[PDB]
Design a binder for this molecule. Sequence first.
Ligand SMILES: Cc1cc2nc3c(=O)[nH]c(=O)nc-3n(C[C@H](O)[C@H](O)[C@H](O)COP(=O)(O)OP(=O)(O)OC[C@H]3O[C@@H](n4cnc5c(N)ncnc54)[C@H](O)[C@@H]3O)c2cc1C
Ligand SMILES: NC(=O)c1cccnc1
Ligand SMILES: [Mg+2]
Length: 309
Amino acid sequence: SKVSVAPLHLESAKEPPLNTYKPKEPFTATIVSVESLVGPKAPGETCHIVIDHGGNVPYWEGQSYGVIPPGENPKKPGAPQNVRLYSIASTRYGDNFDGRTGSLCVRRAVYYDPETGKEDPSKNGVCSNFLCNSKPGDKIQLTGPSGKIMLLPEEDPNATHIMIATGTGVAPFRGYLRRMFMEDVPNYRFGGLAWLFLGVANSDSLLYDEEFTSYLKQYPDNFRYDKALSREQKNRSGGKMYVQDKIEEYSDEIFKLLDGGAHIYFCGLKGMMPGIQDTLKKVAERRGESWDQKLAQLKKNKQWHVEVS
Ligand SMILES: Cc1cc2nc3c(=O)[nH]c(=O)nc-3n(C[C@H](O)[C@H](O)[C@H](O)COP(=O)(O)OP(=O)(O)OC[C@H]3O[C@@H](n4cnc5c(N)ncnc54)[C@H](O)[C@@H]3O)c2cc1C
Ligand SMILES: NC(=O)c1cccnc1
Ligand SMILES: [Mg+2]
């Protein structure tokens, strides 16, 4: 049932690759495909981009690629554009299971006048629209990979991993979950609990939902999946349902899991963190615990994984 992947020598590296390519001399990769991930009612367009790196820019799950969009740096004529980082949304084997491609999950940054709603493409995000406008055969300047915070701890193949995403923050977790459940990786046989929480605006904004729903069916004892749709659902207080509200609903079980050594991951919008922190603080304090001290301990034990912006 698990999908054969190749080449298995991608498992041989003892340390993660880092900054194999730098902005001074990027790797010229090639677009394989670009597809919209979302339906018509989604507030923004999010696309899935498959990139052929030919095996020259391997990575581990949870890392990022840098992309240098074309054109001159506007705040520095003569200079190339600044790198934009994107969380890799694929396993190290990639979506074609061959170790030649990696995938990105990209939200089109688009400017609307607050009063007249008029989109203004001159104020749109350069790299995100460059990427989602790409077509098979287009060239892309790649740097990296980079990142260590979101590397998956594999020392315990029965560990618990609590994955908290908003929007494109789901990207590393798509990679984690394929490695845990989809791909035939003989040296990593996951038998723990993986728990994905995903917050998006509405059902049309969900990302990779059919893939995650399939894991529920195939691995009911090892995978849990909870969604917060902020424009379509209300929390117990009658406000918009955010992922912090779903965390609160399970806060007893989550704290028990953390106390037992679970890893917790946060990826996506930085704006989700204050509300999430308040929720965990409330739960720690009811139990008689200092959240400041508990969080410090979680970080010391390497259980606390944050990459937001
Ligand atoms: C570690 C890391 C990982 C990341 N992972 C992802 C990911 O997986 N997916 C993802 O989508 N993003 C991710 N991001 C964000 C990504 O790096 C980019 O910052 C994002 O895509 C926007 O870059 P851009 O080049 O499209 O926009 P830019 O050209 O940099 O513009 C920035 C913003 O300014 C707005 N803007 C520009 N000019 C004006 C103006 N005159 N008036 C008003 N607004 C203006 C643009 O519309 C845009 O929203 C990540 C960031 C980090 C740090
Ligand atoms: N994938 C994301 O949306 C992301 C990850 C890290 C920082 N900012 C955004
Ligand atoms: Mg959909």
